[PDB]
């Protein structure tokens, strides 16, 4: 649990972590993505 991030490649299905400022994580896509 932290305020880290996730580049365009790292999954995040169950991950409770949050991407960087301006980015968004997809549940079904299970992978961070920019706006």
CSV table of N, CA and C in Angstrom, one decimal:
chain,number,residue,atom,x,y,z
A,1,UNK,N,0.8,-1.2,0.0
A,1,UNK,CA,0.0,0.0,0.0
A,1,UNK,C,0.9,1.3,0.0
A,2,UNK,N,0.8,2.0,-1.1
A,2,UNK,CA,1.6,3.2,-1.2
A,2,UNK,C,1.0,4.1,-2.3
A,3,UNK,N,1.7,5.2,-2.6
A,3,UNK,CA,1.3,6.2,-3.6
A,3,UNK,C,2.2,6.1,-4.8
A,4,UNK,N,2.6,4.9,-5.2
A,4,UNK,CA,3.5,4.6,-6.3
A,4,UNK,C,2.7,4.9,-7.6
A,5,UNK,N,3.2,4.2,-8.7
A,5,UNK,CA,2.6,4.4,-10.0
A,5,UNK,C,2.6,3.1,-10.8
A,6,UNK,N,2.3,3.1,-12.0
A,6,UNK,CA,2.3,1.9,-12.9
A,6,UNK,C,2.4,2.3,-14.4
A,7,UNK,N,3.5,2.1,-15.0
A,7,UNK,CA,3.7,2.5,-16.5
A,7,UNK,C,2.7,1.7,-17.4
A,8,UNK,N,2.7,2.0,-18.6
A,8,UNK,CA,1.9,1.4,-19.6
A,8,UNK,C,2.4,0.0,-19.9
A,9,UNK,N,2.1,-1.0,-18.9
A,9,UNK,CA,2.5,-2.3,-19.1
A,9,UNK,C,2.3,-3.2,-17.8
A,10,UNK,N,2.3,-2.5,-16.7
A,10,UNK,CA,2.1,-3.2,-15.4
A,10,UNK,C,0.6,-3.4,-15.1
A,11,UNK,N,0.2,-4.6,-14.9
A,11,UNK,CA,-1.1,-5.0,-14.6
A,11,UNK,C,-1.6,-4.4,-13.3
A,12,UNK,N,-2.9,-4.5,-13.0
A,12,UNK,CA,-3.4,-4.0,-11.7
A,12,UNK,C,-4.9,-4.4,-11.6
A,13,UNK,N,-5.2,-5.7,-11.7
A,13,UNK,CA,-6.5,-6.3,-11.5
A,13,UNK,C,-7.0,-6.1,-10.1
A,14,UNK,N,-6.4,-6.9,-9.2
A,14,UNK,CA,-6.7,-6.8,-7.8
A,14,UNK,C,-5.9,-5.8,-7.0
A,15,UNK,N,-4.8,-5.4,-7.6
A,15,UNK,CA,-3.9,-4.4,-7.0
A,15,UNK,C,-4.7,-3.2,-6.4
A,16,UNK,N,-4.5,-2.9,-5.1
A,16,UNK,CA,-5.1,-1.8,-4.4
A,16,UNK,C,-4.3,-0.5,-4.6
A,17,UNK,N,-3.1,-0.6,-5.2
A,17,UNK,CA,-2.3,0.5,-5.5
A,17,UNK,C,-2.9,1.5,-6.5
A,18,UNK,N,-2.3,2.7,-6.5
A,18,UNK,CA,-2.8,3.7,-7.5
A,18,UNK,C,-1.7,4.1,-8.4
A,19,UNK,N,-2.1,4.4,-9.7
A,19,UNK,CA,-1.1,4.9,-10.7
A,19,UNK,C,-0.6,6.3,-10.4
A,20,UNK,N,0.2,6.8,-11.2
A,20,UNK,CA,0.8,8.1,-11.0
A,20,UNK,C,-0.3,9.2,-11.3
A,21,UNK,N,0.0,10.5,-11.0
A,21,UNK,CA,-0.9,11.6,-11.2
A,21,UNK,C,-1.3,11.8,-12.6
A,22,UNK,N,-2.5,11.6,-13.0
A,22,UNK,CA,-2.9,11.8,-14.4
A,22,UNK,C,-3.2,10.5,-15.1
A,23,UNK,N,-2.7,9.4,-14.5
A,23,UNK,CA,-3.0,8.1,-15.1
A,23,UNK,C,-4.1,7.4,-14.5
A,24,UNK,N,-4.6,6.3,-15.1
A,24,UNK,CA,-5.7,5.5,-14.6
A,24,UNK,C,-5.5,4.0,-14.8
A,25,UNK,N,-6.0,3.2,-13.9
A,25,UNK,CA,-5.9,1.8,-14.0
A,25,UNK,C,-7.2,1.1,-14.3
A,26,UNK,N,-7.1,0.2,-15.2
A,26,UNK,CA,-8.3,-0.6,-15.7
A,26,UNK,C,-8.5,-1.9,-14.9
A,27,UNK,N,-9.7,-2.1,-14.5
A,27,UNK,CA,-10.0,-3.4,-13.8
A,27,UNK,C,-10.0,-4.6,-14.7
A,28,UNK,N,-10.8,-4.5,-15.7
A,28,UNK,CA,-10.9,-5.6,-16.7
A,28,UNK,C,-9.7,-5.7,-17.5
A,29,UNK,N,-9.1,-4.6,-17.9
A,29,UNK,CA,-7.9,-4.5,-18.8
A,29,UNK,C,-6.7,-4.9,-17.9
A,30,UNK,N,-6.9,-4.8,-16.6
A,30,UNK,CA,-5.8,-5.1,-15.7
A,30,UNK,C,-4.5,-4.6,-16.1
A,31,UNK,N,-4.4,-3.3,-16.3
A,31,UNK,CA,-3.2,-2.6,-16.8
A,31,UNK,C,-3.4,-1.1,-16.8
A,32,UNK,N,-2.4,-0.4,-16.1
A,32,UNK,CA,-2.5,1.1,-16.1
A,32,UNK,C,-2.5,1.7,-17.5
A,33,UNK,N,-3.1,2.9,-17.6
A,33,UNK,CA,-3.2,3.5,-18.9
A,33,UNK,C,-3.4,5.0,-18.7
A,34,UNK,N,-2.8,5.8,-19.5
A,34,UNK,CA,-2.9,7.3,-19.4
A,34,UNK,C,-4.2,7.8,-20.0
A,35,UNK,N,-4.5,9.0,-19.6
A,35,UNK,CA,-5.7,9.7,-20.0
A,35,UNK,C,-5.7,9.9,-21.5
